[PDB]
Design a protein around this nucleic acid. Structure first.
Ligand SMILES: [Mg+2]
Ligand SMILES: [Mg+2]
Ligand SMILES: [Mg+2]
Ligand SMILES: [Mg+2]
Lengths: 151, 127, 100, 206, 114, 86, 98
RNA sequence: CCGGCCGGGAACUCAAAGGAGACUGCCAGUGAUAAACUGGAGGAAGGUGGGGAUGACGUCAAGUCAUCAUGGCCCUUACGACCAGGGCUACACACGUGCUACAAUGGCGCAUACAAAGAGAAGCGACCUCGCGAGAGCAAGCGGACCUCAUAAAGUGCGUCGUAGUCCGGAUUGGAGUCUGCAACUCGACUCCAUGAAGUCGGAAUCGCUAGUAAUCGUGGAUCAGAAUGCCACGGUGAAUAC
RNA sequence: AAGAACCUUACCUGGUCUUGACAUCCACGGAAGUUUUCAGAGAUGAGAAUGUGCCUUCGGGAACCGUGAGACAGGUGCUGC
């Protein structure tokens, strides 16, 4: 976009509950334009981690992804010939979306028997701060912090 | 003693009859839950009526053709929302505030020449 | 496009429809499952006795203007380019520049 | 070498087809090539007679052929014996039974075919192309044709390299589909090779 | 298990078991196991020795493994010696069925040494 | 693999081979037909099949019957190839 | 009872055709069952625009054949006499069926 | 006989003709008070609603003399013409554009939904019978909103396989067939049985896409006797991001 | 190239023709058409039966075929500078 700012889109709520961020999470899951299978993966994973976390269902998910949810993100501007990275404050709308993207990638990289089982256990350990998802956030965080001077 | 609306979305056209009396809903002589009701977008079809009172007050005998699952689902949706003809002006504001009255035209784009899917082209190489 | 060979083609259509389509039963009836008599084999032998050009399959179905093999359209009979040419100048009824 | 044929794009609206008849899958091809052969026969035979355009139609296995021409006297001939003979020939080609109508174009110096074949005659008689096409344009503007573009391409007087000239007067709105614009093109076979000439005339806005 | 030339894998269902012997695929193994009455979902470990004793003769009814490998070798040898076109190609290491030798068909041609 | 009913031979070749058998083997045959099929009676004959440039003599053995004439007259010449080592 | 099924290319032309046949049956002692639009068939063609390469450039063509059904119910003798020879309107193909 | 099957009906899908409707029209703010911009309401649709056709003067001595037309120039008992066979399909290699994968958001088995558009008389070819199948026999209907191609597939339910070069993959070859066609050797497609290669997500590099788009799922047509993983076209599911 | 088994086909090998396969003109005859034999890869070549049909100038016609003479025909041959 050279200039024009666009209104974003109202995404249809998940069928079981009323959370829009969860339906968004579904969208970041699905490959192959298949909403129903990946959405089944969302559910199956969520409820199979639910009782084990001890929180009931969704609030376990927010308290989960909140830990992988970045605060400051680093981009590249004003290259000096060496192309240095500048840290900038990430939008509130991009922080949870970026989170969800990171967790989904985290699930895919290591592998396990099934994605629902895989997603759930990695997220459960993301709520603990074991996961490679949260680790991904911290390395991003270190890189931002090591280069704070530039602003 | 009967009220009507149409609705349609993406190649699938809906026809919807609402009446007073019981609250049961049926699509093509078959129950909603066993027509498409076991697949996701469970909510979309009953949500316009959930925006106001649902109770046992209104029966829906509806039938549709064409399109797939979700195309039909939305078709029905737009069906009810323009089938609430009784009290339509009084429920009109609620509907538009929450949408549903817009048809959402938005149908498939034609495959063009030289490009395979309507917008995608055959990976241009530079030499 | 070499009126030699499109003359060849008018020849082969002449011959071709002068023999088969009528005496083609030499295969069409005999060669099907039915009596399995040796006479049938004799029949296929009579099918190679004939001129090769007799079979219709040999038609390349050229343009009725330039005799151009490729790009032919059997709804019109003209190659794609004279379809376009006559099309725009208005010689073919009903054809319109299409946008749907 | 890009612009679409201005009749073709426009044909849906203000330009009826040069052939008006119906056919099915079977006979479409055969009456269409018969159509070709009748047209080439007439326009070749009448080349001198100045025929503007030929519109043919085929009601109920009979063919009705309307000839639009500038000089009707010569195609009708004395006491209309020649139209009879032509009618015999096109009965032969088109299949029986032929009919013919002679329609006269009231102002031949407008329509594209006649101005085109004129300046292709001047041009084949080695007049200077320049005032051939000047003569054409000023001719069409005298009658008050609301616009014209005459263009000439080719060798142009034995010049070894090809070149293109054109003269546009008044409005010639090619992109207005509604606009009534007549168009044609005619080749001249000259001692130096073919030289083609196109003419657009713009007769009115609606 | 130990029927025909070899067949000794483990953790497998019945047709998936029998596909290990050269010369029996999925469908004809399914023919065997529908022929001798053995259920499909049963791993060979827990089936009784009686119906495997039937399994041995049942698979014996079909020509398998030993004689196959030989008859194949002697068919590729019959062409190879005969001088048939497909023989000539078997011989030269190219494809026979008429595939493109321009670019692809290096599965028989082998990965390039140069 | 082809011709469900009726092995295929062109009649001129079956007659030439018929009167070739009844008259005893003498000389190769000049046939151009790659299209025909070997038959039991044709064995022992040295009949030359057309490879497109000339006729190659092939000595028919009973081990080859179900096959056809063509594939025993290879058309395209290959050679060692360019390769002819550096 | 009897149905003349008429088809053309331009509908502009077909209108007054079916119109003057329906009313030429009206003044011949009516009882006509009326014109029906049915679907129109789209023949569709893509031809390559140039005499030599650039396949990517193609050109679209339609042939839209429009049809109508009239299906008159009671064939009074004068009606069936008036629907023959007065079929007129060159360019349309009208098909008598009983 | 519970199928709009038959009476019946013209209400609604649907069809296709003719019209209505959206143009800054209205409200408010900004703006030279102007043009216009921003936001609101009404509205199915809002500022070019979405898509297509439509490509200015000219450039590249761009492409095409092999569609065609054409000036020169050349061959004329041959550079012309007919025929059979071969060849355009070769293969140590390199590139481009695609299809199929490398798996579990999956494979395999049974059951079960929901499309649009298109073709068809030397044609589409149902029902029934035979064959494991490709198909064969018989034969109805249809120049077609009626008949046929025609069971949409992904999806959904249940059952299993359990990270393995595997029940992934299906290349290669052998055997046995079928359909077209005078004729499947060089050189067709399809089927059945057997065989089950490379491949564990890809270096330097590089490409397409701003929404019914990408991705993925099937369906149709042209050409065409036969010969699509190409081309043109239709619908299903259906995103992420634009600071 | 919207579809190379033969055809397509423009290329190669070999067998063949020279007003020529394709068009008009002239002279000299035959109806066209149909079936059939042999030789040959087929082109073709040598045959044998059958048919003899629509104006009436009847010396002539219409169409198709056949032989000769040339005027020509033919070329997907070169040049898109
Ligand atoms: Mg392309
Ligand atoms: Mg020519
Ligand atoms: Mg063909
Ligand atoms: Mg263009």
């Amino acid at each position: 976009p050279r200039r024009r700012v666009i209104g974003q889109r109202k995404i249809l709520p998940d069928p079981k509950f009323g959370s829009e961020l969860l339906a968004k999470f579904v969208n970041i899951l699905m490959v192959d334009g298949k909403k129903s299978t990946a959405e089944s993966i969302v559910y199956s994973a969520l409820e199979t981690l639910a009782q084990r976390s001890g929180k009931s269902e969704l609030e376990a998910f927010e308290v989960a992804l909140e830990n992988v949810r970045p605060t400051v993100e680093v981009k590249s501007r004003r290259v000096g010939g060496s192309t240095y990275q500048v840290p900038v404050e990430v939008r509130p709308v991009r922080r949870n979306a970026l989170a969800m993207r990171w967790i989904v990638e985290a699930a895919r990289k290591r592998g396990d028997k099934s994605m629902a089982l895989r997603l759930a256990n990695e997220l459960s350990d993301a709520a603990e701060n074991k996961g490679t998802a949260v680790k991904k956030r911290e390395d991003v965080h270190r890189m931002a912090e090591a280069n704070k001077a530039f602003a | 003693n009967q009220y009507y609306g149409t609705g349609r979305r993406k190649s699938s056209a809906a026809r919807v009859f609402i009446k007073p009396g019981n609250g049961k809903i049926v699509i093509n002589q078959r129950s909603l839950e066993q027509y498409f009701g076991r697949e996701t977008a469970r909510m979309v079809v009953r949500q316009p009526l959930e925006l106001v009172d649902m109770v046992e007050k209104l029966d829906l005998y509806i039938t549709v053709k064409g399109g797939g699952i979700s195309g039909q689902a939305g078709a029905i949706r737009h069906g009810i929302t323009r089938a609430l003809m009784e009290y339509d002006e009084s429920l009109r504001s609620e509907l538009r505030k929450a949408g549903f009255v817009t048809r959402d035209a938005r149908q498939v784009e034609r495959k063009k020449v030289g490009l395979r899917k309507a917008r995608r082209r055959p990976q241009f190489s530079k030499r | 496009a070499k009126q030699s060979m499109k003359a060849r083609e008018v020849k082969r259509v002449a011959l071709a429809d002068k023999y088969f389509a009528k005496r083609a039963e030499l295969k069409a009836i005999i060669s099907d499952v039915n009596a399995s008599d040796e006479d049938r084999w004799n029949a296929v032998l009579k099918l190679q006795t004939l001129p090769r050009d007799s079979s219709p399959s040999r038609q390349r179905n050229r343009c009725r203007q330039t005799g151009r093999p490729h790009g032919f359209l059997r709804k019109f009979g003209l190659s794609r380019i004279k379809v376009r040419e006559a099309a725009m100048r208005g010689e073919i009824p009903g054809l319109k520049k299409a946008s749907w | 070498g890009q612009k679409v044929h201005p009749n073709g794009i426009r044909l849906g609206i203000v330009k009826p087809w040069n052939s008006t008849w119906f056919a099915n899958t079977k006979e479409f091809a055969d009456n269409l090539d018969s159509d070709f052969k009748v047209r080439q026969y007439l326009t070749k035979e009448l080349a001198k007679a100045s025929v503007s355009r030929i519109v043919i139609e085929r009601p109920a296995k009979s063919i009705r052929v309307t000839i639009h021409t500038a000089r009707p006297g010569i195609v009708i001939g004395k006491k209309g014996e020649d139209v009879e003979k032509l009618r015999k020939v096109v009965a032969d080609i088109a299949g029986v039974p032929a009919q013919i109508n002679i329609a006269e174009v009231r102002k031949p110096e407008l329509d594209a075919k006649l101005v085109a074949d004129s300046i292709t005659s001047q041009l084949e008689r080695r007049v200077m192309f320049r005032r051939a096409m000047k003569r054409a344009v000023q001719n069409a503007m005298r009658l008050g044709a609301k616009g014209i573009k005459v263009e000439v391409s080719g060798r142009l007087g034995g010049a070894e390299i090809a070149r293109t000239e054109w003269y546009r007067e008044g409005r010639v709105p090619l992109h207005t589909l509604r606009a009534d614009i007549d168009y044609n093109t005619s080749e001249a076979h000259t001692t130096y090779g073919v030289i083609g000439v196109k003419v657009w005339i713009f007769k009115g806005e609606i | 298990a130990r029927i025909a030339g070899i067949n000794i894998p483990d953790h497998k269902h019945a047709v998936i078991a029998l596909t290990s012997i050269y010369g029996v695929g999925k469908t004809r193994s399914k023919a065997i196991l529908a022929a001798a009455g053995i259920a499909e979902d049963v791993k060979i470990s827990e089936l009784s020795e009686g119906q495997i004793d039937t399994l041995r003769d049942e698979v014996a009814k079909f020509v398998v493994e030993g004689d196959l490998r030989r008859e194949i070798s002697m068919s590729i040898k019959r062409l190879m010696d005969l001088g048939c076109y497909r023989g000539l190609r078997h011989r030269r290491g190219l494809p026979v069925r008429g595939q493109r030798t321009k670019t692809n068909a290096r599965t028989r041609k082998g990965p390039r040494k140069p | 693999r082809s011709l469900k009913k009726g092995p295929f031979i062109d009649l001129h070749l079956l007659k030439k081979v018929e009167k070739a058998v009844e008259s005893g083997d003498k000389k190769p045959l000049r046939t151009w037909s790659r299209r025909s099929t070997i038959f039991p009676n044709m064995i022992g004959l040295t009949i030359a099949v057309h490879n497109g440039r000339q006729h190659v003599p092939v000595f028919v053995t009973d081990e080859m019957v179900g096959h056809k004439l063509g594939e025993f007259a290879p058309t395209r010449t290959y050679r060692g190839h360019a390769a002819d080592k550096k | 009872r009897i149905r003349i099924r008429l088809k053309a290319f331009d509908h502009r032309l077909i209108d007054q055709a079916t119109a003057e046949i329906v009313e030429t049956a009206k003044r011949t002692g009516a009882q006509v069952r009326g014109p029906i639009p049915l679907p129109t068939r789209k023949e569709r063609f893509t031809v390559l625009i140039s005499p030599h390469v650039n396949k990517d450039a193609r050109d679209q063509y339609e042939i839209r054949t429009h049809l109508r059904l009239v299906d008159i119910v009671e064939p009074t003798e004068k009606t069936v006499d008036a629907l023959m020879r007065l079929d007129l309107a060159a360019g349309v193909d009208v098909q008598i069926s009983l």
